[PDB]
């Protein structure tokens, strides 16, 4: 089966690096997606994982972008208060444009940085306000990245 999963949020928060860590298991930094197959309940699920450049940032406001998407991950940077502030607007825009059975997930990235300004309780609180699950991650330190996609994939398959 195919699960189309999108990463959404401000430029610079680590969307691409989260995607590279999940697929490649490494931190480093014209085809729009990567395919990674994962076992859920003993059955192969192929995730179709969408990441677009800030360059291409303009699509996220269109319903075309979310065509067939079943998971959407909203990402902010724990080091950047503004990217966290901006999450309510991302939520709203996603709900305006995506399938209503789409499962969403909040991710606070860069948990490795001692310059953190957004607490885990803050992220937890926002997540309840939006009615969604919440995970803190570090693409750099390899912390909680696989959990992001497995958590979301399991929620999507329970929908199905
Ligand atoms: N310390 C730290 N830096 C990160 C992490 N993830 C990404 N970065 C850096 O933040 C910048 C933005 O990452 P990127 O994946 O391009 O963000 P995008 O605009 O959301 O796709 C790059 O310089 C990354 O090296 C992380 O988990 N920890
Ligand atoms: Mg990117
Ligand atoms: Zn790893």
Residue numbers in the entry: 19 to 47, 54 to 184
Study text:
Sec4p is among the 11 Rab GTPases identified in S. cerevisiae and acts on the surface of membranes to regulate transport between the Golgi apparatus and the plasma membrane. To complete the cycle, the protein is reactivated by switching the guanine nucleotide state from GDP to GTP in a process stimulated by guanine nucleotide exchange factors (GEFs). Therefore, the structural and functional analysis of the mutant Ser29Val of Sec4p offers an opportunity to understand not just the basic differences between Ras GTPase families but also how Sec4p is activated during its GTPase cycle by its GEF Sec2p. Sec2p is a highly efficient exchange factor of Sec4p that stimulates nucleotide exchange by binding to the switch regions of Sec4p and altering its conformation resulting in decreased affinity between Sec4p and nucleotide. In this work we have investigated the nucleotide exchange mechanism of the Rab GTPase Sec4p and how its GEF Sec2p stimulates nucleotide dissociation, making use of the Sec4p mutant S29V corresponding to Gly12 in Ras proteins.
